Design an enzyme around this catalytic site. Structure first.
Site, PDB file in Angstrom:
ATOM      1  CG  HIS A  44      -1.035   4.330 -13.004  1.00  0.00           C
ATOM      2  ND1 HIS A  44      -2.349   4.471 -12.628  1.00  0.00           N
ATOM      3  CD2 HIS A  44      -0.379   5.403 -12.502  1.00  0.00           C
ATOM      4  CE1 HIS A  44      -2.480   5.566 -11.898  1.00  0.00           C
ATOM      5  NE2 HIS A  44      -1.299   6.154 -11.813  1.00  0.00           N
ATOM      6  CG  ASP A  88      -4.746   2.249 -12.200  1.00  0.00           C
ATOM      7  OD1 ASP A  88      -3.720   1.557 -12.066  1.00  0.00           O
ATOM      8  OD2 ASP A  88      -4.756   3.515 -12.196  1.00  0.00           O
ATOM      9  CB  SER A 181      -1.087   7.723  -8.965  1.00  0.00           C
ATOM     10  OG  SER A 181      -1.687   8.214 -10.139  1.00  0.00           O
TER      11      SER A 181
END
EC number: 3.4.21.20
Lengths: 223, 97
Positions: A44, A88, A181
């Protein structure tokens, strides 16, 4: 990073800071070097253009130790599911090889297809926000505890223990947060997880991509 | 020429990315356009479209202002708030589906 401390400068030489161009704005993520020409991060964090900084501690200062490299290719996992945040994981091919030194060098990936026992201690590092109110210019880190799968199965509707790790004791206010992230989850100096997602509030537990579940794809894509 | 952070939670989950929207500095924009940006990042970050917003139980975004106030806006509603909003008054935007 919530509830952590500033890292010793250049103690984590595999850390990568990503600046991402999106259609409507800019994003920021972490990542980690796994080979002189490849950074591993979260899918992402994909964008049309990605600038990668290696060797940094204070990313708002322009330290002599930093190496700035664009991503030539940003390869999202073919089954990445945007809606549920499944699979992911993304590999960035650097447009040139980094120059290896004490401040820039890659981190080990897991041996074959390893699980992760609950109670294991693992460290996450990042440049993300430290609370709802402020962030950080320097790399921070915090040690977290792998949870039994039930802690995330009760809280997150699409958590899959085959490919994701449940991380972070609720009672402690320790977690990764916005900006973290793509950063690594290191257990005995091996990158077993990738910061993925959590609750909007940042209260643990949170979900990490389980790196060992993707070892064949990672090795094939780099080869 | 200013960046406004936003966050997105969908079905209880929120990516740990640090994300911003680009706005023209000190520009008055309508809430129709602000909703357009909101819907744009819902689609590009989480694959959420208009039909998904109709069928969710709740779908809202909150504009947090620099002066400490907030405005909570319903994405399932029509009737734009009779007004424009200045870009440099926004601290952040929290999107919740």
């Amino acid at each position: 990073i919530i509830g952590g401390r500033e890292s010793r400068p250049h103690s984590r030489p595999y850390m990568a800071y990503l600046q991402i161009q999106s259609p409507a704005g800019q994003s920021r993520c972490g990542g980690f070097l796994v080979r002189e020409d490849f950074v591993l991060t979260a899918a992402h964090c994909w964008g049309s253009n990605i600038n990668v900084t290696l060797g940094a501690h204070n990313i708002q200062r322009r330290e002599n130790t930093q190496q700035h490299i664009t991503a030539r290719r940003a390869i999202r996992h073919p089954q990445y599911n945007q809606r549920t945040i499944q699979n992911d994981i993304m590999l960035l091919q650097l447009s040139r090889r980094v120059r290896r030194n004490r401040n820039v060098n890659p981190v080990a990936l897991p041996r074959a297809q390893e699980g992760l026992r609950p109670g294991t201690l693992c460290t996450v590092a990042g440049w993300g926000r430290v609370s709802m109110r402020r962030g950080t210019d320097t790399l921070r880190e915090v040690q977290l505890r792998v949870q039994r799968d039930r802690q995330c199965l009760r809280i997150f509707g699409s958590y899959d223990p085959r490919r994701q790790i449940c991380v972070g004791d609720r009672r402690e206010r320790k977690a990764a947060f916005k900006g973290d992230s793509g950063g690594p989850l290191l257990c005995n100096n091996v990158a077993h997880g990738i910061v993925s997602y959590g609750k909007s509030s940042g209260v643990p537990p949170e979900v990490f991509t389980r790196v060992s579940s993707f070892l064949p794809w990672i090795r094939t894509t780099m080869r | 020429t200013v960046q406004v952070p936003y966050t997105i939670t969908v079905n209880g989950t929120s990516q740990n990315i640090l994300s911003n929207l680009t706005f023209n500095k000190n520009q008055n924009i309508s809430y129709k356009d602000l909703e357009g940006k909101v819907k744009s990042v819902l689609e590009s970050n989480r694959g959420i479209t208009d039909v998904d917003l109709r069928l969710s139980k709740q779908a809202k975004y909150t504009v947090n202002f620099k002066n400490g106030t907030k405005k909570v806006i319903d994405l399932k509603s029509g009737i734009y708030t009779a007004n424009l909003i200045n870009s440099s008054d926004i601290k952040s935007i929290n999107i919740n589906v």
